[PDB]
Short mmCIF file of C-alpha atoms and ligand atoms in Angstrom, two decimals:
data_model
loop_
_atom_site.label_atom_id
_atom_site.label_comp_id
_atom_site.label_asym_id
_atom_site.label_seq_id
_atom_site.Cartn_x
_atom_site.Cartn_y
_atom_site.Cartn_z
CA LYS A 1 -30.86 14.60 2.09
CA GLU A 2 -31.43 11.44 4.14
CA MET A 3 -28.37 9.11 3.14
CA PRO A 4 -29.04 5.39 2.38
CA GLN A 5 -27.93 2.79 4.48
CA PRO A 6 -27.44 -0.98 3.56
CA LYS A 7 -29.13 -3.78 5.04
CA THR A 8 -29.04 -4.04 9.06
CA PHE A 9 -29.05 -7.04 11.37
CA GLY A 10 -30.91 -5.87 14.57
CA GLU A 11 -28.73 -4.72 17.34
CA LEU A 12 -25.55 -5.27 15.23
CA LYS A 13 -26.58 -2.92 12.74
CA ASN A 14 -24.07 -3.18 9.48
CA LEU A 15 -21.26 -4.64 11.25
CA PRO A 16 -22.20 -8.46 9.71
CA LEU A 17 -21.74 -6.96 6.19
CA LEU A 18 -17.98 -6.91 6.94
CA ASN A 19 -17.91 -10.60 8.24
CA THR A 20 -16.59 -12.02 5.00
CA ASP A 21 -13.56 -12.63 3.07
CA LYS A 22 -13.78 -9.79 0.93
CA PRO A 23 -15.18 -6.66 2.94
CA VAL A 24 -13.76 -3.72 0.33
CA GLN A 25 -15.36 -5.53 -2.61
CA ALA A 26 -18.45 -5.99 -0.45
CA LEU A 27 -18.39 -2.31 0.17
CA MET A 28 -17.99 -1.40 -3.57
CA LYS A 29 -21.38 -3.68 -4.29
CA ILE A 30 -23.04 -1.66 -1.75
CA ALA A 31 -21.80 1.59 -3.23
CA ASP A 32 -22.89 0.31 -6.49
CA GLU A 33 -26.20 -0.32 -5.23
CA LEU A 34 -26.73 2.76 -2.94
CA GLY A 35 -24.46 5.79 -4.69
CA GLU A 36 -21.98 8.12 -3.89
CA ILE A 37 -22.62 8.22 -0.03
CA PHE A 38 -24.09 5.61 2.43
CA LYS A 39 -23.82 5.48 6.24
CA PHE A 40 -22.67 2.57 7.74
CA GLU A 41 -23.36 1.56 11.63
CA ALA A 42 -21.76 -0.96 14.21
CA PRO A 43 -22.11 -1.07 17.63
CA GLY A 44 -20.51 2.17 19.07
CA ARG A 45 -19.41 3.36 15.65
CA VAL A 46 -20.90 5.49 12.74
CA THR A 47 -19.23 6.35 9.59
CA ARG A 48 -20.09 7.07 6.17
CA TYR A 49 -18.52 5.81 3.10
CA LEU A 50 -17.94 8.05 0.04
CA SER A 51 -17.57 6.77 -3.56
CA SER A 52 -17.78 10.08 -5.65
CA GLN A 53 -15.25 12.56 -6.97
CA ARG A 54 -17.71 15.18 -6.32
CA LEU A 55 -17.94 14.54 -2.50
CA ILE A 56 -14.51 13.21 -2.03
CA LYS A 57 -13.03 16.47 -3.34
CA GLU A 58 -14.60 18.22 -0.54
CA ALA A 59 -13.55 15.58 2.22
CA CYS A 60 -10.01 16.18 0.81
CA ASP A 61 -10.26 19.90 2.13
CA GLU A 62 -7.74 19.75 4.92
CA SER A 63 -9.28 22.97 6.53
CA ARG A 64 -12.50 21.10 7.18
CA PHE A 65 -11.36 17.33 7.69
CA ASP A 66 -8.37 15.71 9.16
CA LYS A 67 -6.87 12.01 9.27
CA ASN A 68 -8.91 9.67 11.18
CA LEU A 69 -7.36 6.23 12.62
CA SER A 70 -9.98 3.72 11.09
CA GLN A 71 -10.69 0.65 13.45
CA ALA A 72 -8.29 -1.12 11.34
CA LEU A 73 -5.35 1.30 11.68
CA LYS A 74 -6.14 1.61 15.38
CA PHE A 75 -5.54 -2.04 15.73
CA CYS A 76 -2.35 -1.70 13.70
CA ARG A 77 -1.14 0.85 16.03
CA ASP A 78 -0.74 -2.02 18.91
CA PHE A 79 2.61 -2.51 16.81
CA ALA A 80 3.00 0.29 14.89
CA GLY A 81 2.95 2.73 17.71
CA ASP A 82 2.88 6.34 16.88
CA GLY A 83 4.90 5.69 13.48
CA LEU A 84 3.85 8.10 10.92
CA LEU A 85 0.85 5.72 9.48
CA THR A 86 -1.02 5.16 12.95
CA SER A 87 -0.47 8.40 14.44
CA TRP A 88 -3.05 11.20 14.82
CA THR A 89 -2.01 14.78 13.10
CA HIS A 90 -1.91 16.18 16.62
CA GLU A 91 0.51 13.94 18.16
CA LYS A 92 3.90 15.40 18.82
CA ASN A 93 5.79 12.46 17.24
CA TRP A 94 3.79 12.80 13.87
CA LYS A 95 5.02 16.16 12.93
CA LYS A 96 8.62 15.41 14.21
CA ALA A 97 8.87 12.47 12.39
CA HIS A 98 7.25 14.04 9.11
CA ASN A 99 9.52 16.81 9.06
CA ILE A 100 12.75 14.45 9.81
CA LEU A 101 11.82 11.92 7.00
CA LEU A 102 10.36 13.98 4.15
CA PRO A 103 13.99 14.57 2.65
CA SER A 104 14.53 10.81 3.22
CA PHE A 105 11.65 10.08 0.90
CA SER A 106 11.84 12.47 -1.80
CA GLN A 107 12.61 12.19 -5.43
CA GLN A 108 16.40 13.16 -4.87
CA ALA A 109 16.57 10.55 -2.01
CA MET A 110 15.66 7.96 -4.42
CA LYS A 111 18.98 8.56 -6.33
CA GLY A 112 20.80 7.21 -3.32
CA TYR A 113 18.38 3.98 -2.64
CA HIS A 114 18.43 3.06 -6.46
CA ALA A 115 21.78 0.81 -6.25
CA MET A 116 19.97 -1.18 -3.38
CA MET A 117 16.79 -1.52 -5.32
CA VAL A 118 18.68 -2.91 -8.33
CA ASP A 119 20.48 -5.23 -6.02
CA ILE A 120 16.79 -6.79 -5.34
CA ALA A 121 15.67 -6.21 -8.78
CA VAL A 122 18.45 -8.17 -10.35
CA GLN A 123 17.88 -11.03 -7.80
CA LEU A 124 14.43 -11.27 -9.12
CA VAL A 125 15.27 -11.31 -12.66
CA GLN A 126 18.03 -13.81 -12.11
CA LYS A 127 15.30 -16.00 -10.54
CA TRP A 128 13.30 -16.30 -13.20
CA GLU A 129 16.15 -16.53 -15.72
CA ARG A 130 17.12 -19.89 -13.96
CA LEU A 131 13.53 -21.41 -13.96
CA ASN A 132 13.44 -24.43 -16.03
CA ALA A 133 11.38 -24.63 -19.49
CA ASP A 134 7.73 -25.30 -18.27
CA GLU A 135 7.77 -24.07 -14.68
CA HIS A 136 6.14 -20.75 -13.56
CA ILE A 137 6.23 -17.92 -11.69
CA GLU A 138 3.87 -17.09 -8.47
CA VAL A 139 3.63 -13.37 -9.08
CA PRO A 140 2.21 -12.06 -6.00
CA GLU A 141 4.98 -14.30 -4.10
CA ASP A 142 7.70 -13.14 -5.93
CA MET A 143 6.48 -9.55 -5.82
CA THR A 144 6.70 -9.71 -2.08
CA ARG A 145 9.78 -11.43 -1.87
CA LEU A 146 11.17 -8.07 -3.89
CA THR A 147 9.18 -5.50 -2.00
CA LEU A 148 10.11 -6.93 1.73
CA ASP A 149 13.91 -7.15 0.59
CA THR A 150 13.98 -3.95 -0.90
CA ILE A 151 12.28 -2.03 1.92
CA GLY A 152 14.75 -3.85 4.47
CA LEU A 153 17.79 -3.16 2.52
CA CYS A 154 16.75 0.59 2.02
CA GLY A 155 15.24 0.82 5.25
CA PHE A 156 17.75 -0.34 7.54
CA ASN A 157 20.78 -2.10 5.50
CA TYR A 158 19.10 -5.59 6.67
CA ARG A 159 18.89 -8.51 4.15
CA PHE A 160 15.80 -10.74 4.70
CA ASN A 161 17.40 -12.87 1.64
CA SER A 162 13.54 -13.64 0.71
CA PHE A 163 14.81 -15.31 -2.68
CA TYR A 164 16.83 -17.52 -0.51
CA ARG A 165 13.83 -19.25 1.22
CA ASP A 166 10.60 -20.97 1.11
CA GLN A 167 9.56 -19.78 4.76
CA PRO A 168 9.80 -16.06 5.25
CA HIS A 169 12.13 -14.61 7.63
CA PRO A 170 10.67 -14.97 11.18
CA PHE A 171 10.05 -11.26 11.61
CA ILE A 172 8.06 -11.31 8.44
CA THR A 173 5.96 -14.34 9.71
CA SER A 174 5.19 -12.50 12.88
CA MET A 175 4.50 -9.21 11.20
CA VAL A 176 2.37 -11.05 8.67
CA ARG A 177 0.56 -12.71 11.86
CA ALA A 178 0.10 -9.44 13.47
CA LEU A 179 -1.57 -7.89 10.65
CA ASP A 180 -4.01 -10.76 10.28
CA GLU A 181 -5.09 -10.55 13.80
CA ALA A 182 -5.48 -6.69 13.59
CA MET A 183 -7.90 -7.34 10.59
CA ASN A 184 -9.66 -10.51 12.28
CA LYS A 185 -10.37 -8.45 15.40
CA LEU A 186 -12.75 -6.06 13.31
CA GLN A 187 -15.81 -8.33 14.20
CA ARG A 188 -15.54 -9.53 17.98
CA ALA A 189 -18.17 -7.96 20.12
CA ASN A 190 -16.82 -9.34 23.38
CA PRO A 191 -13.20 -8.83 23.23
CA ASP A 192 -12.54 -9.90 26.85
CA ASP A 193 -14.35 -13.05 26.72
CA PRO A 194 -11.91 -15.61 27.73
CA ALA A 195 -12.54 -17.61 24.35
CA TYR A 196 -10.17 -15.37 22.41
CA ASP A 197 -7.21 -15.71 25.11
CA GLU A 198 -4.96 -17.68 22.62
CA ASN A 199 -5.28 -14.89 19.84
CA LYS A 200 -4.44 -12.18 22.56
CA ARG A 201 -1.58 -14.29 23.76
CA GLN A 202 -0.30 -15.00 20.31
CA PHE A 203 -0.60 -11.19 19.31
CA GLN A 204 1.51 -10.21 22.10
CA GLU A 205 4.27 -12.64 21.26
CA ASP A 206 4.30 -11.57 17.71
CA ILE A 207 4.65 -7.83 19.11
CA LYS A 208 7.72 -8.88 20.95
CA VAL A 209 9.28 -10.79 17.95
CA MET A 210 9.15 -7.50 15.88
CA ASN A 211 10.31 -5.27 18.57
CA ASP A 212 13.28 -7.60 19.54
CA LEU A 213 14.61 -7.77 16.08
CA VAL A 214 14.12 -3.93 15.16
CA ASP A 215 15.43 -2.72 18.78
CA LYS A 216 18.29 -5.02 18.19
CA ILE A 217 18.95 -3.82 14.59
CA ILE A 218 18.83 0.01 16.20
CA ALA A 219 21.13 -0.95 19.24
CA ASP A 220 23.63 -2.70 16.74
CA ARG A 221 23.71 0.27 14.50
CA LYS A 222 24.48 2.81 17.16
CA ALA A 223 27.09 0.42 18.81
CA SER A 224 28.88 0.02 15.45
CA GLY A 225 28.73 3.77 14.33
CA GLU A 226 28.60 2.84 10.42
CA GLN A 227 27.07 5.41 8.08
CA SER A 228 24.74 3.78 5.58
CA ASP A 229 22.45 5.40 2.88
CA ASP A 230 19.57 3.89 4.77
CA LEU A 231 16.44 5.24 6.34
CA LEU A 232 17.75 4.11 9.94
CA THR A 233 20.94 6.10 9.41
CA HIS A 234 18.88 9.36 8.44
CA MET A 235 16.50 8.83 11.48
CA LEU A 236 19.73 8.39 14.14
CA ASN A 237 21.05 11.73 12.72
CA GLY A 238 18.22 13.97 11.52
CA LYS A 239 17.04 16.81 13.63
CA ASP A 240 13.26 18.00 13.40
CA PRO A 241 13.96 21.57 12.20
CA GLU A 242 10.76 22.86 14.02
CA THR A 243 11.37 21.38 17.75
CA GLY A 244 15.24 20.82 17.14
CA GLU A 245 14.66 17.47 18.48
CA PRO A 246 15.76 14.07 16.90
CA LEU A 247 13.47 11.03 17.20
CA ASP A 248 13.98 8.63 20.19
CA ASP A 249 15.05 5.08 19.94
CA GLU A 250 11.35 3.62 20.47
CA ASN A 251 9.93 6.10 17.67
CA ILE A 252 12.40 4.79 15.35
CA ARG A 253 11.37 1.28 15.99
CA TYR A 254 7.91 2.19 15.46
CA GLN A 255 8.78 4.15 11.81
CA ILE A 256 11.20 0.84 10.96
CA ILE A 257 8.13 -1.55 11.59
CA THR A 258 5.72 1.08 9.81
CA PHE A 259 8.08 1.35 6.70
CA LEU A 260 7.71 -2.82 6.44
CA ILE A 261 3.95 -3.10 7.47
CA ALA A 262 2.78 -0.08 5.33
CA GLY A 263 4.77 -0.42 2.18
CA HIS A 264 5.84 -3.97 1.33
CA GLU A 265 1.93 -5.04 0.56
CA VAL A 266 0.56 -2.25 -1.32
CA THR A 267 3.75 -2.23 -3.27
CA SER A 268 3.69 -5.92 -4.18
CA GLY A 269 0.14 -5.77 -4.94
CA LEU A 270 0.48 -2.82 -7.12
CA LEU A 271 3.16 -4.77 -9.15
CA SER A 272 0.98 -8.20 -9.32
CA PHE A 273 -2.08 -5.88 -10.50
CA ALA A 274 0.18 -4.31 -13.00
CA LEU A 275 1.59 -7.32 -14.42
CA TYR A 276 -1.91 -9.05 -14.34
CA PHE A 277 -3.29 -6.08 -16.54
CA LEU A 278 -0.42 -6.39 -18.86
CA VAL A 279 -1.06 -9.85 -19.61
CA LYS A 280 -4.87 -9.42 -19.94
CA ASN A 281 -3.98 -6.40 -22.60
CA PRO A 282 -1.38 -7.51 -24.74
CA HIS A 283 -1.39 -4.50 -26.88
CA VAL A 284 -0.44 -2.51 -23.73
CA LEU A 285 2.23 -4.91 -22.75
CA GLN A 286 3.65 -4.79 -26.35
CA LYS A 287 3.69 -0.64 -25.79
CA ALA A 288 5.40 -0.90 -22.31
CA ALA A 289 7.77 -3.64 -23.45
CA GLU A 290 8.57 -1.48 -26.50
CA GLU A 291 9.60 1.36 -24.15
CA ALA A 292 11.47 -0.73 -21.77
CA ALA A 293 13.74 -2.02 -24.66
CA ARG A 294 14.34 1.78 -26.07
CA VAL A 295 14.92 2.90 -22.63
CA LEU A 296 16.98 0.50 -20.60
CA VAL A 297 19.93 0.21 -23.00
CA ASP A 298 22.51 -0.86 -20.33
CA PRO A 299 23.10 -3.97 -18.30
CA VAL A 300 21.63 -2.33 -15.32
CA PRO A 301 19.10 0.58 -15.39
CA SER A 302 20.23 3.94 -13.97
CA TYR A 303 18.02 6.31 -11.83
CA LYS A 304 17.90 8.51 -14.85
CA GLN A 305 16.74 5.87 -17.03
CA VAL A 306 13.89 4.82 -14.47
CA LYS A 307 12.66 8.28 -14.85
CA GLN A 308 12.26 7.77 -18.47
CA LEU A 309 9.95 4.96 -18.60
CA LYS A 310 6.89 7.14 -19.05
CA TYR A 311 4.77 4.77 -20.31
CA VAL A 312 5.28 2.17 -17.50
CA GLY A 313 4.64 4.71 -14.94
CA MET A 314 1.06 5.41 -16.81
CA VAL A 315 0.71 1.44 -16.39
CA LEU A 316 1.50 1.49 -12.83
CA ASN A 317 -0.95 4.47 -12.11
CA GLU A 318 -3.82 2.70 -14.28
CA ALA A 319 -3.33 -0.39 -12.13
CA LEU A 320 -3.58 1.78 -8.99
CA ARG A 321 -6.86 3.12 -10.57
CA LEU A 322 -8.43 -0.17 -11.03
CA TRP A 323 -6.97 -1.77 -7.90
CA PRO A 324 -5.56 0.55 -5.30
CA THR A 325 -3.66 -1.66 -3.00
CA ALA A 326 -4.22 0.48 -0.07
CA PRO A 327 -8.43 0.71 -0.57
CA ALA A 328 -9.33 3.13 1.93
CA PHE A 329 -8.73 6.01 4.24
CA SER A 330 -10.57 7.63 7.04
CA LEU A 331 -11.08 11.51 7.92
CA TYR A 332 -13.17 13.13 10.56
CA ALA A 333 -14.70 16.63 10.48
CA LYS A 334 -12.84 19.31 12.30
CA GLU A 335 -16.01 21.48 12.80
CA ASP A 336 -19.73 21.43 11.58
CA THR A 337 -20.02 21.59 8.06
CA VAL A 338 -22.18 20.62 5.06
CA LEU A 339 -20.89 17.98 2.58
CA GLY A 340 -21.79 18.56 -1.18
CA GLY A 341 -24.56 21.00 0.03
CA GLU A 342 -26.86 18.37 0.95
CA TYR A 343 -25.38 16.29 3.96
CA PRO A 344 -24.65 18.34 7.29
CA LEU A 345 -21.83 16.73 9.57
CA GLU A 346 -20.90 17.70 12.93
CA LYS A 347 -17.65 18.29 14.50
CA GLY A 348 -15.99 14.82 14.70
CA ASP A 349 -18.10 13.09 12.33
CA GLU A 350 -16.37 10.44 10.46
CA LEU A 351 -16.15 9.84 6.80
CA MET A 352 -14.36 6.75 4.77
CA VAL A 353 -13.08 7.14 1.25
CA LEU A 354 -13.57 3.98 -0.81
CA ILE A 355 -10.82 4.42 -3.10
CA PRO A 356 -11.44 1.51 -5.88
CA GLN A 357 -14.97 3.24 -6.07
CA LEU A 358 -13.82 6.61 -6.48
CA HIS A 359 -11.64 5.36 -9.19
CA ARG A 360 -14.74 4.06 -11.23
CA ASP A 361 -16.61 7.22 -11.10
CA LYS A 362 -17.94 7.54 -14.53
CA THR A 363 -18.31 11.22 -14.73
CA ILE A 364 -14.60 11.44 -14.41
CA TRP A 365 -13.43 8.61 -16.32
CA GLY A 366 -16.20 7.92 -19.01
CA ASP A 367 -18.32 4.95 -19.40
CA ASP A 368 -15.10 2.77 -20.12
CA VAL A 369 -13.86 2.82 -16.50
CA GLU A 370 -13.39 -0.80 -15.98
CA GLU A 371 -10.85 -0.94 -19.21
CA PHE A 372 -7.29 -0.73 -18.72
CA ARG A 373 -6.06 2.26 -20.59
CA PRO A 374 -2.78 3.61 -19.25
CA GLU A 375 -3.28 6.67 -21.56
CA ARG A 376 -5.67 8.20 -19.33
CA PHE A 377 -2.89 9.34 -17.20
CA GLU A 378 -0.99 11.05 -20.20
CA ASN A 379 -1.50 14.54 -18.60
CA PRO A 380 -1.91 15.07 -14.81
CA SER A 381 -3.67 18.41 -15.50
CA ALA A 382 -6.53 16.73 -17.45
CA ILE A 383 -7.58 14.93 -14.36
CA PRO A 384 -9.82 16.82 -12.20
CA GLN A 385 -8.77 17.62 -8.59
CA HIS A 386 -9.03 14.57 -6.04
CA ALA A 387 -10.50 12.13 -8.73
CA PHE A 388 -7.33 9.86 -8.14
CA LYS A 389 -6.19 9.10 -4.66
CA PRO A 390 -4.30 5.83 -4.20
CA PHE A 391 -1.67 7.77 -2.01
CA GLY A 392 -4.20 9.43 0.08
CA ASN A 393 -4.54 12.93 0.81
CA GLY A 394 -2.60 16.08 1.81
CA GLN A 395 0.02 16.24 4.69
CA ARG A 396 -1.26 12.86 5.51
CA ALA A 397 -0.73 11.33 2.14
CA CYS A 398 1.84 8.63 1.58
CA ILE A 399 5.17 9.40 2.44
CA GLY A 400 6.58 6.34 0.39
CA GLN A 401 4.97 7.28 -2.92
CA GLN A 402 8.06 7.94 -4.62
CA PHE A 403 9.87 4.99 -3.15
CA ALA A 404 7.25 2.63 -4.33
CA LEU A 405 6.71 4.15 -7.64
CA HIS A 406 10.78 4.24 -8.11
CA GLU A 407 10.99 0.57 -6.94
CA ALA A 408 7.97 -0.50 -9.20
CA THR A 409 8.82 1.32 -12.43
CA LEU A 410 12.48 -0.03 -11.94
CA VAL A 411 11.31 -3.76 -11.41
CA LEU A 412 8.53 -3.78 -13.99
CA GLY A 413 10.78 -1.97 -16.72
CA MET A 414 13.43 -4.83 -15.92
CA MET A 415 10.65 -7.66 -16.36
CA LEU A 416 9.44 -6.22 -19.52
CA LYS A 417 13.27 -5.99 -21.06
CA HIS A 418 14.07 -9.44 -20.03
CA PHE A 419 11.04 -11.44 -20.53
CA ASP A 420 8.09 -12.34 -22.75
CA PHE A 421 5.12 -13.14 -20.60
CA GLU A 422 2.27 -15.79 -21.08
CA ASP A 423 -0.99 -16.19 -19.10
CA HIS A 424 -0.73 -19.88 -19.64
CA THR A 425 -3.87 -20.59 -16.85
CA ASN A 426 -6.05 -17.69 -18.51
CA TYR A 427 -6.12 -16.76 -14.97
CA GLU A 428 -9.38 -15.60 -13.47
CA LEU A 429 -8.64 -12.49 -11.20
CA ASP A 430 -9.30 -13.42 -7.65
CA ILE A 431 -8.56 -10.38 -4.80
CA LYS A 432 -7.39 -11.33 -1.63
CA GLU A 433 -7.94 -9.03 0.97
CA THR A 434 -5.97 -8.25 4.13
CA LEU A 435 -5.08 -4.72 5.08
CA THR A 436 -4.45 -4.39 1.31
CA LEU A 437 -5.59 -6.08 -2.09
CA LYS A 438 -3.83 -8.50 -4.27
CA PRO A 439 -4.38 -11.13 -6.97
CA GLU A 440 -4.37 -14.29 -5.27
CA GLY A 441 -3.08 -17.32 -7.29
CA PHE A 442 -1.73 -15.08 -10.14
CA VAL A 443 0.59 -17.16 -12.01
CA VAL A 444 2.42 -16.76 -15.41
CA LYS A 445 5.23 -18.17 -17.60
CA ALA A 446 8.19 -15.98 -18.34
CA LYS A 447 10.44 -16.72 -21.32
CA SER A 448 13.54 -15.24 -21.52
CA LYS A 449 15.09 -12.80 -24.17
CA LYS A 450 18.15 -13.84 -23.23
CA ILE A 451 19.59 -10.44 -22.61
CA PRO A 452 22.55 -10.43 -20.06
CA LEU A 453 22.80 -8.31 -16.96
CA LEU A 454 26.22 -7.98 -17.37
C1 HEM B 1 1.45 1.44 -4.12
C2 HEM B 1 2.22 1.43 -3.16
C3 HEM B 1 1.62 2.13 -1.85
C4 HEM B 1 0.36 2.76 -1.52
C5 HEM B 1 -0.73 2.72 -2.48
C6 HEM B 1 0.22 3.46 -0.35
C7 HEM B 1 -0.91 3.92 -0.10
C8 HEM B 1 -0.95 4.86 1.13
C9 HEM B 1 -2.04 5.32 1.78
C10 HEM B 1 -3.68 5.68 0.90
C11 HEM B 1 -1.88 6.39 2.70
C12 HEM B 1 -2.74 7.04 3.43
C13 HEM B 1 -3.27 6.45 4.70
C14 HEM B 1 -4.37 7.27 5.52
O1 HEM B 1 -4.79 8.30 5.06
O2 HEM B 1 -4.76 6.27 6.32
C15 HEM B 1 -0.35 6.10 2.87
C16 HEM B 1 0.45 6.50 3.96
C17 HEM B 1 1.58 6.06 4.27
N1 HEM B 1 2.31 5.31 3.63
FE1 HEM B 1 1.93 4.31 1.62
N2 HEM B 1 1.63 3.44 0.01
C18 HEM B 1 2.21 2.64 -0.71
C19 HEM B 1 3.81 2.45 -0.39
C20 HEM B 1 4.40 2.86 0.51
C21 HEM B 1 5.94 2.77 0.90
C22 HEM B 1 6.61 2.05 0.00
C23 HEM B 1 5.89 3.19 2.09
C24 HEM B 1 7.40 3.25 2.85
C25 HEM B 1 8.59 2.42 2.36
C26 HEM B 1 4.81 3.61 2.60
C27 HEM B 1 4.71 4.48 3.91
C28 HEM B 1 3.50 5.31 4.23
C29 HEM B 1 3.33 5.87 5.69
C30 HEM B 1 4.70 5.83 6.58
C31 HEM B 1 2.36 6.75 5.45
C32 HEM B 1 2.01 7.56 6.64
C33 HEM B 1 2.16 8.97 6.28
C34 HEM B 1 1.75 10.11 7.28
O3 HEM B 1 0.68 9.81 7.67
O4 HEM B 1 2.58 10.79 7.47
N3 HEM B 1 3.89 3.79 1.77
N4 HEM B 1 0.03 5.14 2.21
O1 IRV B 2 -9.81 1.46 5.88
C1 IRV B 2 -9.34 0.54 5.82
C2 IRV B 2 -7.94 0.09 6.27
C3 IRV B 2 -7.17 0.37 5.07
C4 IRV B 2 -5.34 0.37 5.12
C5 IRV B 2 -5.18 0.89 3.91
N1 IRV B 2 -3.53 0.92 3.93
C6 IRV B 2 -2.86 -0.03 3.63
C7 IRV B 2 -1.39 0.33 3.81
N2 IRV B 2 -1.38 1.68 4.00
C8 IRV B 2 -2.70 1.97 4.31
N3 IRV B 2 -10.49 -0.84 5.69
C9 IRV B 2 -11.44 -0.31 5.24
C10 IRV B 2 -12.24 -1.88 4.48
C11 IRV B 2 -12.05 -3.10 5.43
C12 IRV B 2 -13.13 -3.26 6.05
C13 IRV B 2 -13.27 -4.45 6.94
C14 IRV B 2 -12.42 -5.23 6.95
C15 IRV B 2 -11.04 -5.04 6.28
C16 IRV B 2 -11.13 -3.94 5.28
C17 IRV B 2 -12.70 -0.11 6.11
O2 IRV B 2 -12.45 0.08 7.27
O3 IRV B 2 -13.65 0.26 5.61
#
């Protein structure tokens, strides 16, 4: 089969199609028009966007396809280095850091992070308890305060103290600005044109800000000798069972930067979309709130109680189905191969997995794919293979999946226990796009149930 291709712009091919505020949503509309696979060309680039479970289940065959660095991840590598997210599978530091960090991200390690997650979650609840009568909540903003502070505390015992600020910590300002520059660079045809000399100069300044703080944090920890229950301690002490080597200080820095750029935005986006769908579906909200009240019987949630928030977990998965906050990942063919019995690929050919469109495959989910129904996730065995991929695939899947879902389940559970929520503006979903997706301008009012935290 000849695969379809969206409209072209002469020598720029398809590139101008991504010169828009909402490129993922533009790609979703193209998939609606062209189907499960389309070619996408830019100067010096060819890829193929996949949208059907039928083809993506083959793309997830690790014997045939390996992780590719998208252009987006290639530009993030300028500050995330050879951290886990922006490393090639064949780089020595990927397998080393992977082996060392897996035990630090397990479901069992969440038991040790739980107290620190509760610390920040309680700060969120207390902020909302302290709002005056007809004040409102800026949801994505507060969720980002929470996830940034949680990763900072669990990552390297550092308090960004985001709930004490209107202006973010200087590291966060530089990180956000570096991510924005990485995403903006996806359109420039003459990078060395002197017109962008200021962007380049600003980009380097933000990189130095992040490195200096993280390098200082590492140096301070080695100088104090203190042992915490954070990822930094595990990385200073861990040894790769395979090579027997530890991570060096440079790679440890890249991992810390990666944890912050990799998990803060996708996780706050998940919480924001989850709360959005809950207030738009009051029957679902009531069911989730009933579970929270039944399970969270103590002033502070325990680790075990979070595991019992089954329906809250399904709410989070259904929010990830409709709006997976990490919207795509990239693959390359390890050898010549045929995709779906119709599209021959040569060794090295690239694929993009368009996750929000995969999750709308009506052959998998039925005709009501746009409806928010957490009950779809009652039984993981009922879900066909590779139909649900918000955390990527295989050995290159999200190492932070357990962390993100424990944090989100804890916080969402506490939110549902302590407040009733009002969609007081009848908010119209508007999805802002960066590296990730989030509902911009989403606001609610939260009326306290007056349940103490002591
Ligand atoms: C809802 C929350 C999250 C979502 C949807 C998500 C999504 C993803 C996806 C799709 C990938 C695969 C990327 C690719 O193949 O190019 C990935 C990888 C990764 N994620 Fe997440 N993530 C989340 C939270 C987190 C958190 C909280 C952390 C750290 C605290 C984290 C750290 C990482 C790392 C290090 C990788 C690279 C793993 C490797 O290749 O070895 N993520 N994530
Ligand atoms: O593929 C990625 C990078 C996604 C990173 C996912 N992620 C987030 C955190 N961890 C992982 N963008 C997609 C979509 C896109 C296209 C143009 C401009 C912006 C976005 C693409 O290039 O087609």
